[PDB]
Amino acid sequence: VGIRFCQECNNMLYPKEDKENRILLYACRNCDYQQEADNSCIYVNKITHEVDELTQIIADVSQDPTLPRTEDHPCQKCGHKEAVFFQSHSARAEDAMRLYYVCTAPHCGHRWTE
Amino acid sequence: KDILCRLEHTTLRKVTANTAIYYDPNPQSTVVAEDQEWVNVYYEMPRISPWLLRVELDRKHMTDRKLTMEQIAEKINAGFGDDLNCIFNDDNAEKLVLRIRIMNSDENKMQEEEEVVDKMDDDVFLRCIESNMLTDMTLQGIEQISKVYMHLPQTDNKKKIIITEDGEFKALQEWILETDGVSLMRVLSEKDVDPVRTTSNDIVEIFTVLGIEAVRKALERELYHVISFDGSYVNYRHLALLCDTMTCRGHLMAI
Amino acid sequence: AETPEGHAVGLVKNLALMAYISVGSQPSPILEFLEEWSMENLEEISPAAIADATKIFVNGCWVGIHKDPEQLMNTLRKLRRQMDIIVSEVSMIRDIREREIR
Amino acid sequence: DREVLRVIFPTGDSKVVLPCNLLRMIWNAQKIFHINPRLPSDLHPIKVVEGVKELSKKLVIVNGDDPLSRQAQENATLLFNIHLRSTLCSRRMAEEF
Amino acid sequence: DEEETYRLWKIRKTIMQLCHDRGYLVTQDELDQTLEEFKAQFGDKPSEGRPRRTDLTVLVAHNDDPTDQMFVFFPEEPKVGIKTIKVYCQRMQEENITRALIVVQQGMTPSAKQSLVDMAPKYILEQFLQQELLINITEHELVPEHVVMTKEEVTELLARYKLRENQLPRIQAGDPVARYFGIKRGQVVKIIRPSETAGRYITYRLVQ
Amino acid sequence: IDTLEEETVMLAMTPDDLQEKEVAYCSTYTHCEIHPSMILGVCASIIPFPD
Amino acid sequence: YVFAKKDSKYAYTGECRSCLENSSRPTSTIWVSMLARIGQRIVATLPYIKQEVPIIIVFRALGFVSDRDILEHIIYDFEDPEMMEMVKPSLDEAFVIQEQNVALNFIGSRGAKPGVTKEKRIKYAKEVLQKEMLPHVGVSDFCETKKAYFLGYMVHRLLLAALGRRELDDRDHYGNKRLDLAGPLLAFLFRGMFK
Amino acid sequence: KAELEAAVRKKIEFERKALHIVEQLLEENITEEFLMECGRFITPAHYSDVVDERSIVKLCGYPLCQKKLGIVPKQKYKISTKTNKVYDITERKSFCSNFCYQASKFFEAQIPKTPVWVREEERHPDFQLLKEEQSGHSGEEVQLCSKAIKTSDIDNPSHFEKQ
Amino acid sequence: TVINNWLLIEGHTIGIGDSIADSKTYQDIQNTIKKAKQDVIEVIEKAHNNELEPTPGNTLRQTFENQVNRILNDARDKTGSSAQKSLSEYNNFKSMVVSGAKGSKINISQVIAVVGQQNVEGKRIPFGFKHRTLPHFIKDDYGPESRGFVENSYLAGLTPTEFFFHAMGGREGLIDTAVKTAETGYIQRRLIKSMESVMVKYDATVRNSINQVVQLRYGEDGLAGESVEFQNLATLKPSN
Ligand SMILES: [Zn+2]
Ligand SMILES: [Zn+2]
Ligand SMILES: [Zn+2]
């Protein structure tokens, strides 16, 4: 799923097969560097792609004046009464109209959907 | 809805939840822990490629289209044969998947310059196959009909107007489909599609399927619809004359 | 409201009454202030720090990164509201979600 | 003729476009001749039948004496004649008009 | 499988109606037989079965004179070429008949169809795909009634309207309903359609 | 304020109404309109009662 | 500005009309598109170059030979596995070229004047990347780690659009417009006449 | 005269091409030079008609081959692992052996592309192509020289030394 | 002429007070609008808590959009009707509309009741700033005020944002007008030059310039189009 980088030329490690032991290697094509993989996976296509948006939203948005605040949704982490809700607005999950909250107390920035 | 799913194009990409090209050399080992059991069901007694394209298909999307993986394997070896093995579980088990492996080229076809032509590695090859066979297997449908809307009509122009044995007109309400994309000749030749109705709003397709008089009548119907949409009224004389000028030469004449 | 009608409807427009089209300026005072206010250039940084810091563009050209963009926007506004270094017609947008200060 | 109409208009929309408002000429006549609708009429039903029969022969769109000309005539005035015979009925012209 | 029996049966039903329209003596019971009688008579099992493409091949005689007959040939081959159309012609040479009708599955190569027409005067042959016979188009809602005017009737027409054939509307000789009726250039189709202004209308079209 | 700095601001139309405590709509206003009729040009400032 | 090309061959296209401080030479638009549909490779439509150029070729022509040293300018958080697999298909179209000068040759081979000498084509591509690619970033002999950062920004922002993580740009928004009054118009008219 | 002789010339050309297809259909009585003088007439589409016609009759679409095509596979794609390519068997199904396919494809590749009306216009490049095609199919007759017999479903867009 | 002169005796005018409705109708329209507000508010709360289930076929966003447009168009039409039902007989707007002479009853609805929802390309006012329609609204506001619902009549006057959304949505009218006039002139000229030589000949056939039969009888019944008229058939409706 990720990119492995060589350790000599720092180019990208492409997967190849180890016949004599039949084990998946990652080998660089500018060196003879090889690395016995730990994944045994080469490529993953997520078509439905259930995504967490609680991970894209950065807590800095609690500094937005144009964002609606709330009181009847206290942060579970710190118990701060206020929050700052908004929607996804992302071409993938733009279909639903789910609200995410970002605790507005400084130093907390705890995101949560309900 | 059964005829609906028989008409609408269902490729493999619309069914797939996710894919994954594992490296799995000995299927009895089965790097994927979940498959391991039913895989030996095919390996109790049946070479193979180590690269394994594992497709997890969505379940609700195959309940809808009334698709079973049996038919997906059939579609696949219909295009590739047993050049490309497919394995599948039994459907009463959860998260039905499909394990595909490019079988091999058995012992012949020697002496060629394969390493010379810088052949793609087997993983890249299986991925190109996964795009070649994901874009379209066309498990169902007419490959020109993108979307299909089933619904009950309310305007009497699309209701089955019969004459009761009493002698009076009665409007029977019943389901009609509205596709998107025309394959008239293929559509109206299948079971439980009314061939004596089932028009189209494409007069070139009507001209090629049903002829010049049918395109005259349908062209008049479409003009009448476009014009009578906003409650307007044009006499039939004028529509008839326009549609007689447009089609009196044997073919469709734009003006 | 004010537009012609016919073939140029909506193509010819008119300013509102208090709308002012800015005349231009020089970014050099702002660039010096930014350097002096703990903004790291695009040479004295490691692209590992560029990740959770705030880009800082000035006239399109990406000029640096800053690790406290809240305090920086307060400072730049407080300066434009006195006409110290930043003239009054200088725009200072902060994309909070995009992490940029243009 | 009713069974013919059920073929021409299979949807059942009876509003057609024909070249003579017959329900208005019948009204012009009821007014021009001061027809008292409270009195026994003196119009013989056979006279209605025979009169519309000979009227339908003066409404000539395709002048005949020719099998295909006679067929084109019968088609050209097939709907107006159905109308004319169902409004200048003998039952209607004796209990309605 | 039962699906191919359905398609064979539907095509045979369309061909029975197509021969009935062209004026061939088709018995009424053979004109409307449901799938069950088709199975019982032919086999209901197309693959590995008696109801093969061949052995469902109809020879119907015209109504004016039973000398003028017509075959409808279902070739077993998916595609059809010059060799099989020539064996079909030399078969039509016996029992002295001249109309044939080849119901192909994938069609014919342009050279093969060109060789089909060069047998113009003695063996009028003509090709029909399966896909076109799975429905009778003359039973659609949009398709009016077409009758084929004998030569005496078209002569009487033109002498009554003082017309020349090049003054009539035109229908192409490869029109679907012109292919259905086996109409060739110079013939006149008579389209009867019901009109909402007059009640009925008879237009004529010249096959160009 | 210019047209893209105007997307980070939270305008009020009138002080007399918008920044008065009530059932809260927004309470983080950052700017205020001088007069909302300054949105009109020279030839539309002649029209009386254009609303 | 990242827009979505309706059809063509690009799913997304991110342009940047660049102009120097004092508009000595006119604006020079550079595009960075992502082909529709290995995978969706990224190409860079440079000025004074007739063909598209793989983006990693343009990053190697600037002197960032390696492959981590090209994604550090494009992907600022390496623990984003979803954005990296979008650049994987493009670190392959430029797999053959692993050095700066063969990349500069690859670029100069597409110019307006395809010279005969490898050295002359290299120098042509060198000055086209040094003066006509993103001039607002700088025109100098060391404005290359700033053009790399800015072109990595354009690529990263094209990826954010393709991942559906940022709205495509509105062409009618007025933050995206500038009005040329009698000052800019007449200064543009006076450059030519003093020239 | 101008278009009247045009009609009669290209109609005699039609029936001549018809019996050309018929000679092609023959199981033998086709010599290599017979094939030369017939391919003198045949156009691309016409040779495609040849191969389809004989493929229908379970006879190899190539003139020189007389092997019967007893069984034909139903699959549309044949993926090879010797080299890594998916091959489109949609014409190879028309032949009995691989070298026959390559021979025929090479033959119509070296067919005259100018239309038959202006083909016998110049017999100079025509017979040039005739001895050309004889040499080519002879090389095809001795040996195949490449096991790539089913076109190529190309899906490889990466560049090699296009620098 | 005789009507112009009787109108010298009688006179017709239009003024304020024709545009004003009694306090009963004002309360009716205010309550209709307030109900529509709180109904869109509860629909929005459904969407924000996921109790909204997409109607079969389109989306969840399009489900919400159709539901809201439905509520708001019902509000506008109910206000328009509840206003026109209060127009006195002494009112001159009623005089205008019931004889169909001038204006539509929707015009008078907007003058008296509510201007209603403004649409740009069929949808509510687009989110033209970043996630808001104007810099006066909070990000992600789907309420009716935010997306273009003008809830004032032209007698009460539009607030500054309603004024702008109305200008936005009424420029679409000005552009549609121009594009429609252009397309229409084109279609008219194409028709007119297509069928301009077709004419009934002296043997009743309709023929074109090449003297080719288009119709064997005009309108396939032979009658001129102005002398015909709508009539029922009377043997096409009853039972046996
Ligand atoms: Zn390496
Ligand atoms: Zn908190
Ligand atoms: Zn062979």
The ligand with the least distance to the CA atom of H54 is 3
3-state SS class at H80: strand
Q: A45 vs chain B: nearest CA distance in angstroms?
A: 5
Given a contact cutoff of 8 angstroms between Cβ atoms, the answer to whether B22 and B32 are in contact is yes
The beta strands (E) that lie in C1-102 are given as 40-41, 54-58, 61-66, 94-95, 100-101
CA distance A9 to I61: 49
Cα I161-I164-I167 angle, rounded to 5 deg: 150
Q: Do the bridges between strand C54-58 and strand C100-101 make them parallel or antiparallel, or are there none, so unpaired?
A: parallel
Residues E15 and E84 in one domain: yes
Q: Counting runs of H as helices and runs of E as strands, what totals does chain I give?
A: 7, 6
Q: Which two tokens stand for residue B159?
A: 């209701």
How many CA atoms, within 13 angstroms, populate the side-chain half-sphere of residue G126? 13
Burial B101-126 (b: 16+ CB within 10 A, else e): bbbeeeeeeeeeebeeeebbebbbbb
Resolution of the experimental structure, in angstroms? 2.8
Q: Which CATH architecture has domain G1-177?
A: Alpha-Beta Complex (3.90)
Question: At G153, which amino acid appears?
Answer: Y
3-state SS class at A46: strand
Residues E171 and E115 in one domain: no
The verdict on whether residue A41 carries a ligand-binding annotation is no
* Residue numbers of the domain that contains E145: 136-208
How many domains does chain A contain in total? 2
Q: Do the bridges between strand C54-58 and strand E107-108 make them parallel or antiparallel, or are there none, so unpaired?
A: unpaired
Q: At what angle do helices H4-25 and H32-39 cross, to 10 degrees?
A: 150
Given a contact cutoff of 8 angstroms between Cβ atoms, the answer to whether E171 and E159 are in contact is no
Residue showing tokens 């191919």: E4
Which are the contacts of G108, defined by CB distance < 8 A and separation ≥ 6? G114, G115, G120, G121, G122, G123, G124, G125, G126, G128
Q: Do the bridges between strand C100-101 and strand C94-95 make them parallel or antiparallel, or are there none, so unpaired?
A: antiparallel
Distance G93 CA to ligand 1 centre (A): 17
**Residues of A with Cβ-Cβ distance to C70 under 8 angstroms:** 60, 63
The percent of chain I in helix, strand and coil, each rounded to the nearest 5, is: 50, 5, 45
Which are the contacts of H152, defined by CB distance < 8 A and separation ≥ 6? H85, H87, H88
CA distance I156 to C35: 55
Residues A38 and A68 in one domain: no
Residues A73 and A98 in one domain: yes
3-state SS class at H7: helix
E70 strand-pairing partners = E60, E99
Residues E131 and E157 in one domain: no
Last residue of a domain, one of E83, E110, E135: E135
Burial H121-150 (b: 16+ CB within 10 A, else e): eeeeebeebbeebbebbeebeeebeebbbb
Question: At G122, which amino acid appears?
Answer: I
Residues E127 and E184 in one domain: no
Q: Which two tokens stand for residue B193?
A: 């599609």
Q: Which of H97, H104, H92 is nearest to H133 (CA)?
A: H104
> For E65, left (φ over 0), alpha (ψ -120 to 50), or beta?
beta
> For B90, left (φ over 0), alpha (ψ -120 to 50), or beta?
beta
Residues E52 and E117 in one domain: yes
Given a contact cutoff of 8 angstroms between Cβ atoms, the answer to whether I142 and I44 are in contact is yes
CA distance D31 to H87: 90
Chains that touch E (3 or more CB pairs under 8 A): B, D, H, I
Residues E176 and E84 in one domain: no
Q: Counting runs of H as helices and runs of E as strands, what totals does chain F give?
A: 1, 0
CA distance D10 to D6: 5
CA distance C43 to C34: 15
Task: Tell whether A107 is within 8 A of chain G (Cβ).
Answer: no
CA distance A71 to A85: 11
Given a contact cutoff of 8 angstroms between Cβ atoms, the answer to whether E97 and E59 are in contact is yes
How many CA atoms, within 13 angstroms, populate the side-chain half-sphere of residue C100? 14
Given a contact cutoff of 8 angstroms between Cβ atoms, the answer to whether A9 and G60 are in contact is no
Residues E108 and E128 in one domain: yes
Residues surrounding ion ligand 1 at CB below 5 Å: A 6, 8-9, 11, 28, 30-31, 33
E24 strand-pairing partners = E62
Pick from G136, G166, G183: CB nearest C98: G166
Cβ burial of H35 (10 Å; 0-12, 13-18, 19+) is buried
Query: What length does chain I have?
Result: 240
Q: Which of B122, B86, B104, B127 is nearest to B48 (CA)?
A: B104
**Residues of I with Cβ-Cβ distance to A66 under 8 angstroms:** 131-132, 135, 138-139
Does an H or E element contain G28, and which?
Answer: strand G28-35
Chain C, chain G: beta-carbon pairs less than 8 Å apart: 32
The ligand with the least distance to the CA atom of H68 is 3
The 3 state secondary structure assigned to chain B is CHHHHHHCCECCCCCEEEEEEEECCCCCCCCCCCCHHHHHHHHCCCCCCCEEEEEEECHHHHHHCCCCHHHHHHHHHHHCHHHEEEEECCCCCCCCEEEEEECCCCCCCCCCCCCCCCCCCHHHHHHHHHHHCCCCCCCECCCCCCCEEEECCCCCCCCEEEECCCCCEEEECCCEEEECCCCHHHHCCCCCCCCCCCCCCCHHHHHHHCCHHHHHHHHHHHHHHHHHCCCCCCCHHHHHHHHHHHCCCCCCCCC
Q: Which two tokens stand for residue G177?
A: 């417009």
Task: Tell whether I4 is within 8 A of chain B (Cβ).
Answer: no
Cβ burial of I153 (10 Å; 0-12, 13-18, 19+) is buried
3-state SS class at A86: strand
I229 strand-pairing partners = D18
CA distance D60 to D53: 13
Last residue of a domain, one of E100, E135, E170: E135
Diameter of chain F measured on Cα atoms:
39
Task: Nearest chain A residue to C99 by CA: give it.
Answer: A60
CA distance B96 to B106: 30
Residues E126 and E141 in one domain: no
Q: Do the bridges between strand G28-35 and strand G10-18 make them parallel or antiparallel, or are there none, so unpaired?
A: antiparallel
Which are the contacts of G157, defined by CB distance < 8 A and separation ≥ 6? G2, G14, G166
Given a contact cutoff of 8 angstroms between Cβ atoms, the answer to whether I40 and I72 are in contact is yes
Does an H or E element contain G122, and which?
Answer: helix G118-127
Q: C5 vs chain I: nearest CA distance in angstroms?
A: 8
CA distance B247 to B226: 19
* Residue numbers of the domain that contains A102: 46-114
Residue showing tokens 């697999």: G85
**Chains C and D make contact, 3+ CB pairs within 8 Å:** no
Interchain contact, G164 vs A92, CB within 8 Å: yes
CB atoms within 10 A of CB G171: 9
Question: At H71, which amino acid appears?
Answer: I
Given a contact cutoff of 8 angstroms between Cβ atoms, the answer to whether F9 and I135 are in contact is yes
Does an H or E element contain E108, and which?
Answer: strand E107-108
Distance A85 CA to ligand 2 centre (A): 13
Residues A57 and A68 in one domain: yes
Q: Which of H1, E163, E198, A92 is nearest to I211 (CA)?
A: E163
Interchain contact, A63 vs C97, CB within 8 Å: no
CA distance E156 to E163: 10
Cα I185-I186-I192 angle, rounded to 5 deg: 85
3-state SS class at E113: helix
Would you give the DSSP letter of residue C48? T
Residues A67 and A112 in one domain: yes
3-state SS class at G52: coil
Does an H or E element contain G121, and which?
Answer: helix G118-127
Given a contact cutoff of 8 angstroms between Cβ atoms, the answer to whether D77 and D84 are in contact is no
CA distance B131 to B139: 15
The 3 state secondary structure assigned to E161-192 is HCCCHHHCCEECCCCHHHHHHCCCCCCEEEEE
Task: Tell whether G77 is within 8 A of chain C (Cβ).
Answer: yes
Domain B1-136 has what CATH class? Answer: alpha beta
Q: Which of A65, A69, A55, A53 is nearest to A103 (CA)?
A: A69
Q: Do the bridges between strand E79-80 and strand E107-108 make them parallel or antiparallel, or are there none, so unpaired?
A: parallel
Residues A6 and A57 in one domain: no
Q: Which of G190, B1, I215, C94 is nearest to A63 (CA)?
A: C94
Question: At B214, which amino acid appears?
Answer: A
Given a contact cutoff of 8 angstroms between Cβ atoms, the answer to whether B30 and B101 are in contact is no
The ligand with the least distance to the CA atom of G67 is 1
The beta strands (E) that lie in A2-107 are given as 13-18, 23-28, 34-36, 41-46, 69-70, 83-86, 100-102
Q: How far is CA G139 from CA C25, C86, G135, G144, in A?
A: 21, 26, 6, 9
Diameter of chain E measured on Cα atoms:
61
Given a contact cutoff of 8 angstroms between Cβ atoms, the answer to whether G132 and G107 are in contact is no
CA distance D11 to I237: 10
What's CA F3's distance to the chain center, in Å?
A: 14
CA distance G135 to G21: 9
The verdict on whether residue A108 carries a ligand-binding annotation is yes
Q: At what angle do helices D78-87 and D67-76 cross, to 10 degrees?
A: 60
Residues A60 and A114 in one domain: yes
Residue showing tokens 């003028």: E68
Residues A57 and A107 in one domain: yes
Would you give the DSSP letter of residue E24? B
Q: Which two tokens stand for residue B115?
A: 């390493």
Which are the contacts of B93, defined by CB distance < 8 A and separation ≥ 6? B38
Q: Which two tokens stand for residue C89?
A: 């017609």
3-state SS class at H41: coil
Given a contact cutoff of 8 angstroms between Cβ atoms, the answer to whether C2 and F45 are in contact is no
**R_g (Cα) of chain D, nearest Å:** 15
Does an H or E element contain E201, and which?
Answer: strand E201-207
Residues E58 and E129 in one domain: yes
**Residues of A with Cβ-Cβ distance to C97 under 8 angstroms:** 57-58, 60-61
Would you give the DSSP letter of residue A97? -
Q: How far is CA B220 from CA B247, D18, E59, E198, in A?
A: 11, 20, 40, 17
CA distance G134 to G155: 14
